[PDB]
């Protein structure tokens, strides 16, 4: 009776207070509220829904506060998500005694406001969050820290599009393995174990193949140096996401090594050759004709362009094209990179804004505080095009996986309806992503065209499998 | 006889228009009008046969014909042709019974979506 | 007019079987070109998906060709063992 008189008759007022207690952090008041309301039968649903709505609104406001900056700054987005998530997790653990309903509501709200936000609307796609998470992971891994990794892992399970994150992480791991700039192998091993716990065995086996290729390359390099400064890495084309390079002319000074190693491979392996990549190849060169001795770290294209100035004086862009054989866009980007650093320069402010046409040059001053200098920088517009290509590959792979899943489903069941194939396809791929019906439908017509499925004459809504 | 050939046209024109046999004729038209070297019928040829065969029977033949000209600049597959007649048979003036998640090709549903606002 | 010398060089190369990289084993057409059945029919939605398919044995084949081969036989033609898709 008393609980009815004291608590039940004023519950509405309690609700009016609840939102207020959510505006100003008062853990003790919330705990007292939960303890008193817990006596009332099925009286916690309104509190649960109010808490979920408040969490969603606060998360949306926090994401919108840092708009226009989190698009190219993943770290800010991850930190904004993580602080809110940890604050509400601590609040649920303390005030609400880790109730199942409260944690379920928190998970629902987090899944709601993580996939969709102002950043998602600006990017016009829901795949931006996994890309930002992968970028943050790569930045953390590339050159006390396991807590952040665990936080990222516990946040990642709320992502409904895991294929994009997996592909981006694999690509970044391949890039970090090709160039030897890693903070520690122990962190990589811990990340591999965490992904093994989270993801499947095949995804980690791909990375294990990558590590095995790296080890084989190291062993081949040590065998080469025993047989004989030149360092090369040999990787399988079918287990790495790199693409073939464009046409390029090998510099004469670098020819000597090229003939020596290749024949060695022909001595060790018969029936295979090597397709050299130049965009991912870098080196160091030394110049002694300046005021002070200098050493510069450059790429293959930059080194070739520089070695074209040895023995000549001013060149014009038509020449640098017909001798080195570099495409107009790549050559223009490399020339712009070289310019923005004062090494090849009629004195123009808009080096950033310049239009380059075939007309022009080494500038012999070039002082700098540091003895050794890194002029290798990422291209201006390579990242955006790479992201678009990765996204397109993701969509094509999604279509291929749906086309293969339908085929493998239509072999256990000779005949199947149209409302039982779609549910099976959705539930089979639900671990990775949720395909849309028109995407699943567009694959069915392709399979029927390729003589994989047949519509029975008597019923247009029931497919069958033919050999 | 020559008189038999002359009199053939009225009777089998009358008989072919009945359902069932007309289904077989419509199915046979795809293979008859298609070159053996290509599985897909050309756009212009398909439009010509749509005009010739479905004259008057299709309620929205004039509207359907103007489609797939500035948008679908590709050949027509065999499955769309087979289901076009069923779609025409089942369709109504209001076009409110159509379903976007059914067993219809991606062309029929997009045509329905395009033609929905204008009515 | 300047003097430049290189101290070290780092290069990355990819290895593949030369017997099949130039042209597919199933069809003698170029690997970068369209397949045999994708050339006769060139106005369909199946002609915009003919790409390269790779396996564990680093064997490159056309996706349609390997898919058709894996409809009655489950072995890679050149090495005679189970074929598993690796990348597209
Ligand atoms: Zn093909
Ligand atoms: Zn082929
Ligand atoms: Zn093989």
Curated annotation (Swiss-Prot), chain A:
GO molecular function terms noted in the UniProt entry: protein-macromolecule adaptor activity; ubiquitin ligase complex scaffold activity; ubiquitin protein ligase binding
GO biological process terms held by the UniProt record: animal organ morphogenesis; cell population proliferation; G1/S transition of mitotic cell cycle; intrinsic apoptotic signaling pathway; positive regulation of canonical NF-kappaB signal transduction; proteasome-mediated ubiquitin-dependent protein catabolic process; protein K48-linked ubiquitination; protein monoubiquitination
A single GO cellular-component term on record: SCF ubiquitin ligase complex
Post-translational modification: Neddylated; which enhances the ubiquitination activity of SCF. Neddylation prevents binding of the inhibitor CAND1. Neddylation leads to structural rearrangment in the complex that allows interaction between the E2 ubiquitin-conjugating enzyme and the acceptor ubiquitin. Deneddylated via its interaction with the COP9 signalosome (CSN) complex. (Microbial infection) Deneddylated by Epstein-Barr virus BPLF1 leading to a S-phase-like environment that is required for efficient replication of the viral genome.
Keyword Transmembrane attached: no
Domain Cullin neddylation: 397-457
Pathways per UniProt: Protein modification; protein ubiquitination
Cross-linked residues, Glycyl lysine isopeptide (Lys-Gly) (interchain with G-Cter in NEDD8): 411
Keyword list, A-Z: Host-virus interaction, Isopeptide bond, Methylation, Ubl conjugation, Ubl conjugation pathway
Expression sites (tissue/organ): Expressed in lung fibroblasts.
UniProt KW Ribosomal protein keyword: no
Family, similarity comment: Belongs to the cullin family.
Domain notes: The Cullin neddylation domain restrains the RING domain of RBX1 in the E3 ubiquitin-protein ligase complex; this restraint is removed upon neddylation of the cullin.
Protein name: Cullin-1
Full-protein positions shown: 290 to 776 of 776
Swiss-Prot record, chain B:
UniProt superkingdom: Eukaryota
UniProt KW Repeat keyword: no
PTM remark: Mono- and poly-ubiquitinated by ARIH2 and ARIH1. Monoubiquitination by ARIH2 is mediated by an interaction between autoubiquitinated ARIH2 and the UBA-like domain. The monoubiquitinated form preferentially interacts with non-neddylated cullins and modulates cullin RING ligase (CRL) complex composition and activity.
Sections of the chain in a coiled coil: none
Expression tissues: Expressed in pancreas, kidney, placenta, brain and heart. Weakly or not expressed in liver, skeletal muscle and lung. Strongly overexpressed in thyroid tumors, bronchioloalveolar carcinomas, and malignant tissues of squamous cell carcinoma of the oral tongue. Not overexpressed in aggressive adrenocortical carcinomas.
KW Cytoplasm (keyword) present: yes
GO cellular component: cytoplasm; cytosol; nucleoplasm; nucleus; ubiquitin ligase complex
Molecular functions (GO terms): cullin family protein binding; ubiquitin conjugating enzyme binding; ubiquitin-like protein binding
This protein's UniProt keywords: Acetylation, Cytoplasm, Nucleus, Proto-oncogene, Ubl conjugation, Ubl conjugation pathway
GO BP terms in the entry: positive regulation of protein neddylation; protein neddylation; regulation of protein neddylation; regulation of protein ubiquitination
DCUN1 domain sequence ranges: 1-116
Compartment annotation: Nucleus; Cytoplasm
Main function: Part of an E3 ubiquitin ligase complex for neddylation. Promotes neddylation of cullin components of E3 cullin-RING ubiquitin ligase complexes. Acts by binding to cullin-RBX1 complexes in the cytoplasm and promoting their nuclear translocation, enhancing recruitment of E2-NEDD8 (UBE2M-NEDD8) thioester to the complex, and optimizing the orientation of proteins in the complex to allow efficient transfer of NEDD8 from the E2 to the cullin substrates. Involved in the release of inhibitory effets of CAND1 on cullin-RING ligase E3 complex assembly and activity.
Protein name: DCN1-like protein 1
Span within the parent record: 133 to 251 of 259
Swiss-Prot record, chain C:
MF terms in GO: cullin family protein binding; molecular adaptor activity; NEDD8 ligase activity; NEDD8 transferase activity; protein-containing complex binding; RNA polymerase II-specific DNA-binding transcription factor binding; ubiquitin protein ligase activity; ubiquitin protein ligase binding
Coiled coil: none
EC category: transferase
Zn-finger segments (RING-type): 35-80
The keyword Electron transport belongs to this UniProt entry's keyword annotation: no
Gene Ontology annotations of biological process type: cellular response to amino acid stimulus; cellular response to chemical stress; cellular response to oxidative stress; cellular response to UV; DNA damage response; MAPK cascade; negative regulation of canonical Wnt signaling pathway; negative regulation of insulin receptor signaling pathway
Tissue: Widely expressed.
Effect the entry attributes to changing residue 38 to A: Strong reduction in ligase activity
EC numbers on record: 2.3.2.27, 2.3.2.32
Catalytic activity: S-ubiquitinyl-[E2 ubiquitin-conjugating enzyme]-L-cysteine + [acceptor protein]-L-lysine = [E2 ubiquitin-conjugating enzyme]-L-cysteine + N(6)-ubiquitinyl-[acceptor protein]-L-lysine; S-[NEDD8-protein]-yl-[E2 NEDD8-conjugating enzyme]-L-cysteine + [cullin]-L-lysine = [E2 NEDD8-conjugating enzyme]-L-cysteine + N(6)-[NEDD8-protein]-yl-[cullin]-L-lysine
Effect upon mutating residue 59 to A: Strong reduction in ligase activity
Gene Ontology cellular-component terms listed: Cul2-RING ubiquitin ligase complex; Cul3-RING ubiquitin ligase complex; Cul4-RING E3 ubiquitin ligase complex; Cul4A-RING E3 ubiquitin ligase complex; Cul4B-RING E3 ubiquitin ligase complex; Cul5-RING ubiquitin ligase complex; Cul7-RING ubiquitin ligase complex; cullin-RING ubiquitin ligase complex
Pathway terms, separated by semicolons: Protein modification; protein ubiquitination; Protein modification; protein neddylation
Disulphide-bonded residues: none
Record's keyword annotation contains Transmembrane: no
Family: Belongs to the RING-box family.
Protein name: E3 ubiquitin-protein ligase RBX1
Organism: Homo sapiens (Human)
Portion of the parent chain present: 19 to 106 of 108
């Amino acid at each position: 009776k008393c609980e009815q008189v004291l608590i039940e008759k004023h519950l509405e007022i309690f609700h009016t207070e609840f939102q207020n207690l959510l505006d100003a952090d008062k853990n003790e008041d919330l705990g007292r509220m939960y303890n008193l309301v817990s006596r009332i039968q099925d009286g916690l649903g309104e509190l649960k829904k109010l808490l979920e709505t408040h969490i969603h609104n606060q998360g949306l406001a926090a994401i919108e506060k840092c708009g226009e900056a989190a698009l190219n700054d993943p770290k800010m987005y991850v930190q904004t998500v993580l602080d809110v998530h940890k604050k509400y997790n601590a609040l649920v653990m303390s005030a609400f005694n880790n109730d199942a309903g409260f944690v379920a509501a928190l998970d629902k709200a987090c899944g709601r406001f993580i996939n969709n936000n102002a950043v998602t609307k600006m990017a016009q796609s829901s795949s931006k969050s996994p890309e930002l998470l992968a970028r943050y992971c790569d930045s953390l891994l590339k050159k006390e820290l396991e807590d952040t990794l665990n936080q990222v892992m516990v946040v990642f399970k709320y992502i409904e599009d895991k294929d994009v994150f997996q592909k981006f992480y694999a690509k970044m791991l391949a890039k970090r393995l090709v160039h030897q700039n890693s903070a520690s192998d122990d962190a990589e091993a811990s990340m591999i174990s965490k992904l093994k716990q989270a993801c499947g065995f095949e995804y980690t086996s791909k990375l294990q193949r990558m590590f095995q290729d790296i080890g084989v390359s190291k062993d081949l390099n040590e065998q080469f140096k025993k047989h004989l400064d030149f360092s090369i890495q040999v990787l399988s084309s079918g287990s790495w996401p790199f693409q073939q390079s464009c046409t390029f002319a090998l510099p004469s000074e670098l020819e000597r090594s090229y003939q020596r190693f290749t024949a060695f491979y022909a001595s060790r392996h018969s029936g295979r050759k090597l397709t050299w990549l130049y965009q991912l190849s870098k080196g160091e060169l030394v110049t002694n004709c300046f005021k002070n001795r200098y050493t510069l770290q450059a790429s293959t294209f930059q080194m070739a362009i520089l070695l074209q100035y040895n023995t000549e004086d001013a060149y014009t862009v038509q020449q640098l094209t017909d001798s080195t054989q570099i495409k107009m866009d790549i050559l223009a980007q490399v020339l712009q990179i070289l310019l923005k650093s004062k090494l090849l320069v009629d004195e123009n402010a808009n080096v950033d804004e310049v239009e380059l046409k075939p007309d022009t040059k080494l500038y012999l001053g070039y002082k700098n505080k540091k003895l050794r200098v890194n002029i290798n920088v990422p291209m201006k517009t390579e990242q955006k095009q790479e992201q678009e290509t990765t996204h397109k590959n993701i969509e094509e792979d999604r279509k291929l996986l749906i086309q293969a899943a339908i085929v493998r489903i239509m072999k256990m069941r000779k005949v199947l309806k149209h409302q039982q194939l779609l549910g099976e396809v959705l539930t089979q791929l639900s671990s990775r992503f949720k395909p849309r019906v028109p995407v699943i439908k567009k694959c069915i017509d392709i399979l029927i065209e390729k003589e994989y499925l047949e519509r029975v004459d008597g019923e247009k809504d029931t497919y069958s499998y033919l050999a | 006889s020559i008189e038999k050939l002359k009199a053939q046209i009225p009777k089998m024109e009358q008989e072919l228009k009945e359902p069932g046999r007309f289904k077989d004729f419509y199915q046979f038209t795809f293979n008859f009008a298609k070159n053996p070297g290509q599985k897909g019928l050309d756009l212009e040829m398909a439009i010509a046969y749509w005009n010739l065969v479905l004259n008057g029977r299709f309620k929205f033949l004039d509207l359907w014909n103007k489609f797939l000209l500035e948008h679908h600049k590709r050949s027509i597959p065999k499955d769309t042709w087979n289901l076009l007649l069923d779609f025409s048979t089942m369709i109504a003036d209001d076009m409110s019974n159509y379903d976007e998640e059914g067993a219809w090709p991606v062309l029929i549903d997009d045509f329905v979506e395009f033609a929905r606002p204008q009515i | 007019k300047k003097r430049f010398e290189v101290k070290k060089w780092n290069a990355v190369a990819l290895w593949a079987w030369d017997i099949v990289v130039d042209n597919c084993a199933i069809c003698r057409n170029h690997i970068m070109d369209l397949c045999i059945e994708c050339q006769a029919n060139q106005a369909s939605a199946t002609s915009e998906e003919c790409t390269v398919a790779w396996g564990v044995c680093n064997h490159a084949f056309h996706f349609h060709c390997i898919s058709r081969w894996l409809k009655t036989r489950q072995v890679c033609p050149l090495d005679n063992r189970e074929w598993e898709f690796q990348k597209y």
